[PDB]
Design a protein around this ligand. Structure first.
Ligand SMILES: [Mn+2]
Ligand SMILES: [Mn+2]
Ligand SMILES: [Mn+2]
Length: 94
């Protein structure tokens, strides 16, 4: 149906992301999406805040993706409606 892209820092993605969302940080977004997804695919993106989200949507649309929409409120808005999330294995040297 549609693909979900998390454009936040990969470190952030690891701490929790929308279940099934793909990790595609802003800096590598156009490259990865261009090589992994067809431009006719319905894409839904969320980042850390409205600003970063908008930036990502504009980058994808300018790259030729025909259907790119924003998930308003991002991860917080998603958890607010009881949506599923996943955390990734990683460690901290802190
Ligand atoms: Mn962490
Ligand atoms: Mn490890
Ligand atoms: Mn290590």
């Amino acid at each position: 149906a549609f693909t979900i892209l998390d454009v936040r820092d990969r470190s952030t993605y690891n701490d929790g992301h929308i279940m099934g969302a793909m990790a595609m940080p802003i800096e590598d977004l156009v490259d990865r999406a261009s090589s992994s997804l067809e431009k006719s695919r319905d894409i839904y993106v969320y980042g850390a805040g409205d600003e970063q989200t908008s930036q990502a949507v504009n980058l994808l649309r300018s790259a030729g993706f025909e259907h790119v929409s924003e998930l308003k409120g991002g991860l917080a808005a998603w958890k607010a409606i009881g949506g599923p999330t996943e955390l990734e294995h990683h460690h901290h040297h802190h």
